[PDB]
Amino acid sequence: FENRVAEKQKLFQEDNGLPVHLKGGATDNILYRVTMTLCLGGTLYSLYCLGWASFPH
Amino acid sequence: GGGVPTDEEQATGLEREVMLAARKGQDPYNILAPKATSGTKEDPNLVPSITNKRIVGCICEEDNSTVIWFWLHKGEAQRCPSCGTHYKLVPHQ
Amino acid sequence: HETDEEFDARWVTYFNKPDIDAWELRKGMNTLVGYDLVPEPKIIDAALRACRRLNDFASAVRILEVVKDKAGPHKEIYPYVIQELRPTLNELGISTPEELGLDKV
Amino acid sequence: TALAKPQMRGLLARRLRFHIVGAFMVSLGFATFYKFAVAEKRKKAYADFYRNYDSMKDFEEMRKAGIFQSAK
Amino acid sequence: MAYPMQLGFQDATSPIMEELLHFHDHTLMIVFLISSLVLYIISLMLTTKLTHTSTMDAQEVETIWTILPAIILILIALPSLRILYMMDEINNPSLTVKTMGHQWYWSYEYTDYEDLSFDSYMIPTSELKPGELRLLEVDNRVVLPMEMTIRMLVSSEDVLHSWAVPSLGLKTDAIPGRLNQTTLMSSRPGLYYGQCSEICGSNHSFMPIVLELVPLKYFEKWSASML
Amino acid sequence: MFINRWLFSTNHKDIGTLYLLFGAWAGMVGTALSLLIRAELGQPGTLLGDDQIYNVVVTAHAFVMIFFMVMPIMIGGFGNWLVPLMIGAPDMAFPRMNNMSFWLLPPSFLLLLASSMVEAGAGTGWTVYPPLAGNLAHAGASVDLTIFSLHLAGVSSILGAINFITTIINMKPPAMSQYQTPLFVWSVMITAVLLLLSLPVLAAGITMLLTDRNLNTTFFDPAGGGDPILYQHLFWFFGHPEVYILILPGFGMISHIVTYYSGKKEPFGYMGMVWAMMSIGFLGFIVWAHHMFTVGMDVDTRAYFTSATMIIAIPTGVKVFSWLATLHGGNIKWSPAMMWALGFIFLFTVGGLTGIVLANSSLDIVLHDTYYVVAHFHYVLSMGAVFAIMGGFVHWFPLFSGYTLNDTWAKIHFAIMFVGVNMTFFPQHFLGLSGMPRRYSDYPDAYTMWNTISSMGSFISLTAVMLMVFIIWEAFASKREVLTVDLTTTNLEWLNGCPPPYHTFEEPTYVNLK
Amino acid sequence: APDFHDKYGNAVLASGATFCVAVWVYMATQIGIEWNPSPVGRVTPKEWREQ
Amino acid sequence: AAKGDHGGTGARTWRFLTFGLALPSVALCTLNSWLHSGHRERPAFIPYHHLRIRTKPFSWGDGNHTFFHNPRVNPLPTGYEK
Amino acid sequence: HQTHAYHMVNPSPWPLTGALSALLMTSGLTMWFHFNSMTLLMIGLTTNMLTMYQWWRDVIRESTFQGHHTPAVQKGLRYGMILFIISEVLFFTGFFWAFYHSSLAPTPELGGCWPPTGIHPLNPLEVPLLNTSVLLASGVSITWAHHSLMEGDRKHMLQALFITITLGVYFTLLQASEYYEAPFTISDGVYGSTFFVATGFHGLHVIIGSTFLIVCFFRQLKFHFTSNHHFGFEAGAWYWHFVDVVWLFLYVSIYWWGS
Amino acid sequence: HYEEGPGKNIPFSVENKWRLLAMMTLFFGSGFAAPFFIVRHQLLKK
Amino acid sequence: SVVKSEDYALPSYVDRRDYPLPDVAHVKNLSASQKALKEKEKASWSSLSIDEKVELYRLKFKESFAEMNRSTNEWKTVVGAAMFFIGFTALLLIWEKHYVYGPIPHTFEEEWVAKQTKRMLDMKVAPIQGFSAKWDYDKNEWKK
Amino acid sequence: ITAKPAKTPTSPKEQAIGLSVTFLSFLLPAGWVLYHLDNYKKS
Amino acid sequence: KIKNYQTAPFDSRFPNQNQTRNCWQNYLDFHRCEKAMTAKGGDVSVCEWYRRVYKSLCPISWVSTWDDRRAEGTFPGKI
Ligand code: HEA
Ligand code: HEA
Ligand SMILES: CCCCC/C=C\C/C=C/C/C=C\C/C=C\CCCC(=O)O[C@H](COC(=O)CCCCCCCCCCCCCCCCC)COP(=O)(O)OCCN
Ligand SMILES: CCCCCC/C=C\CCCCCCCCCC(=O)O[C@H](COC(=O)CCCCCCCCCCCCCCC)COP(=O)(O)OC[C@@H](O)CO
Ligand SMILES: CCCCCCCCCCO[C@@H]1O[C@H](CO)[C@@H](O[C@H]2O[C@H](CO)[C@@H](O)[C@H](O)[C@H]2O)[C@H](O)[C@H]1O
Ligand code: CUA
Ligand SMILES: [O-][O-]
Ligand SMILES: [Cu+2]
Ligand SMILES: [Mg+2]
Ligand code: NA
Ligand SMILES: [Zn+2]
């Protein structure tokens, strides 16, 4: 392997105004939206599960 | 063998700025406590700033637990309201 | 530590410095009123004459106000201090807060 | 007529000195009062009750009143 | 039992409870004194126009603020611990009674000679007899001989409970798998009430304790009659 | 912009504001639960039901007030707002981890509310003793949801503790030593160390309760060789450090409030105040078993824990007398914040002294699990902790918002609250001495009067809480913007204006060493 | 210039005190609240035991 | 202890310890544990009430098998499987 | 703009996603324990690993690639890691407290003895001793890794770090085998309770520490570490030594003295 | 950057005091109301 | 006079009895006549009139010590409003008794209490101080 | 502390509205639940 | 023999509030003595003191559970 740190330092110091969690490129946006969708969708599902568990069956 | 980079080769950003400035004996990012002068009007404490004002904390006597805080403005030297030692702002950068 | 006489002589000397500036006058009075005492008339006299050298009539009246305030409920302290200061008040033309109506709420 | 020179130093410390001693005096007054009106009162009440107390006579009065499950 | 508008402890029925009353009187006076002193000093600091706002030296006065409370704590600890160990003192009991906690009632066992055991349930409010006490009466009381040192053993067969009788200075937790011991000595006959003192479910408030103290002769005949 | 600022925050001021909003909302929940308690006890008989629903309310009352009201307001709220400002720091050491400490709490609160909605709730008490909390007497998800709620709150405070200790130690000006930091900063660090050391023990205890309930372990089950008393040791080893976690930030704010409104530049006996808070924290780890005087421990152990508990009165007394010495000679400003602090000093002392009464294991036999204990800790919590929170809130509200409160309304609010809390809890001393047990939905007839008066007091406190909401509305409605603040020379947190800019101390303060 | 307290202080104090005493006296005595006072010096003991 | 090589603890010294002491010790323990391997005769089943606790069924399988159940050595509350 | 050395972090969603993941994992465990479903639990675990990956990814971006880790920022992270380990020590302390409480006072239900009647403990001189030599050897090899990195030796750093990871995996496989072979289970009273809960949480920490070392291994492969700046390795080394010491206490207390 | 100053460092609007009154009413009211409706929920189950 | 928000970093004026000489003058900008007054102040103060002396004081200071230390009638508003909300609380208690609380148990009926009182006296409840100690068993009445 | 006059003054009548609305937001929902308690207990 | 038994006397081996081991020990002692007397053709009456103490101290449900488990062969103590 060769030292490619200088290329990453240039990429993540690029003056594009992007936050660090999105500065890697389009793949960061996809991984973020996958994470947030599962979190928000799972949270809504947990609220449904609470409603079901709150009454006898 | 080698193969491990050094800070001289690979440090970047603010870390490199601190490293290179310390190698010149400079402290632009306020890592060290400044040493006081005698604090007279003729020999005031010189407070660097990038703006025209900066908050000064004055420990009037050694081992005082109370710190005296005040804004030091550009212009004529100002005195600590508790002990009267003089401070003068030196803007640059 | 230091006697009452040494303390008063320190403050008399402090206010008697001929070229005392406005900052040192305020610093002196603001520090002095923190102590558990009403300042001796000789101290106030030196402070009032410092106001004269600084061409500051208003601070001289304020100093008389804070003498009365430091006395708290002891009503007899302020008339005594004014009595002892009357020659200085007449010499310098310093009107008391009462003569100026500044004791009225 | 001139006015006499009043005490001008340490008036706050003198007020504190006077009333801290005063509070100490009142504390002793309360301790004596409390020992007499509460502590000793409880001591004598229990001592007077049991000096000539008759537990069998007490029981018989309770039994005749019908309070017991085991003693009619 | 407690009476309406009661301010302090129920009247002592045991010598140990009598010691607790006297230690509480001794301690309550100190609590009254310190709180009054603090309240007064507060008003003292707030009722003068005189001022002193410069730096105050603290070392000398903090000797007073430390030695005096330390001495006071010692005058509390000494009688407190003396009562603590006299509670624990070796005594020679003449009878051992076990109580088992249940949801939601107490069962008692007298197994020194015969196998006497029974349950003790709260008298419901609708079934109280005129003059009986709401939430306090039981169907089967704990009959005990008066003026005799009794060993009580406390346990439980389900959740935690606590067997308490304030008149006698008694409170012993009822823990399953554990046999806790306390001593009981009543100076007088009568009825002495207590209530479960550990949260134990839906009827935690409704499983009281009633001790019936009678002469030995009546206790012996009562024990025989309950075989 | 809104989502980036308030959901993705890395700013100590905004995160502190979120904690304050969260704690205020929780305070409403805890207040409603407290009224449901005293409504059940307001007259003899049963109002809601048997002890199950009652103690579910009692259990949630304690949890909401402690973990969701006091701790987020004092530590997460005032701590995040004031600590960086008081040391001239640009932010917390871990500003992004700081945001997760907050956002763990709404799910923690959700889990608590879920436990009371499913099955019959967790009617166990905030101590959650087994076997009542076990899977036999409390089958179902309620207790497990309670445990997980405590897990999330535990993680939140442990990470917050790591953040505060690191920030206070590492991010001061290079010339400022630890003995040049304000007392509130001291109180937060000591609180953070108690959190760091005590919560992991709690997390271990309740994890063992979880496995006992769901994985057939028997840590607390005698059938398998376990011991229910082991849980009590594990809980209370955290439990007492927790009550000192609840009061220590109050101690720090009281020091600042009393100093400020006495016109003083410094509190009396600074080093004595530091010594006392550190002594109180240390002693708070070796006294836990005074919550267990009736469980059947040896006399020698009961003699030690009686003695070790009482020592704590010495460092605490130093703080009380130093507060009085700070008042001595001051130009007293009778602000509403000062009134809260003056009420704190007296009422906390009363509650502290009744704690010393309970420290005596002999006397505690008759007083344990009675309302004398309830009288003890409500004086130090519902009057101590609460007044410190209210005093701090009315003192620093102009700094946080840039608007001023109506001082007359705030003094009226204090007057109503003072009457309400004392009418509520002072008669409970009588109920405790006379033998009324804790956690009862109903009581023998003899206890009627003091229960009636106590419940009437709680309604007075409700009126104060409702007035408080109006007073906050009136301040934001009128928009009286702050101009000048006194004593900025010894109160650094005010020196950047009201409110301070989003970024403060971008250029750090100048402090030389001489 | 007279502020709110100079204009309305006396009325707020008098009306507040009068309203507070009146409604608490009414609540304490007129709606059937059970205070359960001590029977000492007020209740005549009555026979309770039956056959 | 017995070794002396002090004065400079560095990469070479710690590799010396890794290959000269640490890994040989693992080899010896592996060897030792390899001679003592092999199944032992499982003991007679006694339905002790402090063992095989079942207060709530497990959340997997049939609710009666522990997570890493071994049929050879782990009996059920009713005894060993077959 | 700033003239201090501290790090102002970009606004980040990972605190929220991490907190929501904790909600999903805890409500998932409740769903699993009581309502016979693992769905919520799997979503929580997945979001938890996505949060941890992207969070620590950003920390590497902020430090290696953007240079925000000044000596002052490093010192703060040093305090953070030490304090975190301390909180982990107190967590295990509770379990050691539980163990000694049960074993020093064996109840009648156990037969009044320790080990309890019907419990046949593992031999501490067989695999438990092997596991002890494995973790002790990994402490030596990770120290060689550290000195190799400080002296600038890339090849031997990766050599020692791989050996340390292999030993960590070796311990996990041996423990997994010991779990299956054990004649006692977690349901065999307080002996099985204290044994598996304490060693199980330790085994989890071994897996966490091994993952941390693997992260440092691949970061070393990509030349992230300098000979002077490498706190990610140091934190992993501190955590690995913590894991080792906990085992030594487990071995002495539960495997040896408790046998 | 973000808005700064009074009324701008908060996640709720204070532009209109009456809209704010409704929001504070909903915010604090829902917290106070929640335990009463949870008690109602439990009583309506058994 | 006019103080602004962005002024927070500058020295400001305060009226404190323990800080009699503030950092700045109350009035900063002087009119033509006020400028001439300050020039006259450099001469003997005996030549100043009473009105001019008051004017010099009001330029340096905002309120006098008497003005800044004056008492107010705020306590009447605070105490009176506090009793109103405490009085309003009783309205909530009246509503609760009327609409929420049902009947109290039958053990509080007058006849039950009378019989319960005798039974307590028959078992000698609190005979040393608390209850039965206040009953005269010889005279069959409450002790006077 | 010194402050500016209110940028949007709240008159006594406006305060009466806010006070009434605040109290009613606390009292009405809880009052409704407590009023219908007997319906909940026996149904 | 030296009998006049009222209740179990103080035992210095078990001097604390927790009396679990006192009941457990005497239950063991009686049945260990009973087994010794039965096996070698003696009289169980020599075990009477242990019988009186454990019956005084032990809860009925403890004895009954221990009795069932001795008969079932699952008693964990050594007899
Ligand atoms: C803010 C919370 C808080 C605080 C500060 C305290 C402070 C103290 N507490 Fe309290 N306590 C609780 C919250 C708190 N407590 C809670 C919540 C419970 C019950 C939990 C439950 O069961 O649910 C409890 C229960 C509790 C018990 C158990 C009673 C029982 O359950 O049977 C005991 C007994 O030792 C106790 C003691 C003390 C002591 C000695 C102090 C001391 O720190 C107080 C020291 C202060 C002073 C002593 C006053 C100031 C000192 C002076 C003015 C000097 C002069 C004084 C003397 C010379 C004595 N507490
Ligand atoms: C901090 C903790 C705390 C607080 C504040 C309170 C507040 C109150 N508590 Fe509570 N209580 C406990 C902690 C607390 N309690 C604990 C730990 C128990 C033991 C639980 C158990 O046994 O398991 C208990 C038990 C308890 C009982 C016993 C139940 C029983 O044993 O059967 C009772 C009954 O009278 C009671 C009453 C009250 C009352 C009337 C209040 C009232 O004073 C409420 C008054 C309102 C407030 C104090 C306002 C709240 C604060 C805010 C809204 C902040 C506002 C926000 C900002 C300013 C930003 N409490
Ligand atoms: C090296 C292998 C390690 C084991 C890997 C298995 C799963 C990993 C999970 C990690 C959980 C860590 C702690 C779990 C506690 C107990 C687990 C004990 C360790 C273990 O795995 O031991 C097994 C447990 O089984 C079982 O059900 C296990 C059931 C798992 C249920 C999960 C419960 C998780 C609870 C977490 C609570 C929160 C943790 C604390 C957070 C505090 C925050 C402040 C024993 O198996 P057995 O079938 O009895 O056979 C033995 C003889 N053949
Ligand atoms: C595997 C199956 C389930 C397991 C669940 C959890 C999974 C495992 C997670 C293991 C931990 C991985 C952590 C990766 C951290 C990478 C980021 C990193 O290491 O970041 C470093 C900073 O350290 C830092 O934040 C260090 C901060 C990291 C602390 C993490 C410590 C472990 C925490 C894990 C959670 C424990 C849970 C406890 C259970 C009770 C970067 O600084 P440097 O390297 O000095 O500077 C870069 C140089 O190039 C400059 O020249
Ligand atoms: C501790 C928490 C606070 C407790 C104290 C509450 C203070 C007073 C709140 C009043 O609440 C309202 O009371 C009405 C009665 O006065 C109820 O109307 C009820 O009664 C009316 C007349 O009887 C009917 O017209 C309505 O339909 C019926 O809902 C109404 O629902 C309820 O919201
Ligand atoms: Cu049994 Cu409470
Ligand atoms: O808890 O004290
Ligand atoms: Cu405690
Ligand atoms: Mg208890
Ligand atoms: Na009730
Ligand atoms: Zn200075």
Numbering used by the authors:
A (entry chain J): 1 to 57
B (entry chain F): 3 to 95
C (entry chain E): 5 to 109
D (entry chain I): 2 to 73
E (entry chain B): 1 to 227
F (entry chain A): 1 to 514
G (entry chain K): 6 to 56
H (entry chain G): 3 to 84
What does the paper say about this structure?
HCOs are terminal respiratory enzymes present in all three domains of life: bacteria, archaea, and eukaryotes. HCOs receive electrons from the respiratory chain and reduce molecular oxygen to water. This exergonic reaction is coupled with proton pumping across the membrane, which contributes to maintaining the proton motive force that is further used for ATP production. HCOs are multi-subunit complexes, and their constitution varies among species; however, subunit I is a catalytic subunit common in all HCOs.
X-ray diffraction data with a resolution of 2.2 Å were obtained from a mtCcO crystal soaked with T113. We also determined the apo-structure of mtCcO under the same preparation conditions. The Fo(T113)–Fo(DMSO) differential map confirmed that this electron density did not originate from water or lipid molecules, and showed the highest difference. In addition, mammalian mtCcO has 10 more subunits encoded by genomic DNA. The existence of an additional helix in mammalian mtCcO makes the pockets distinct from bacterial HCOs.
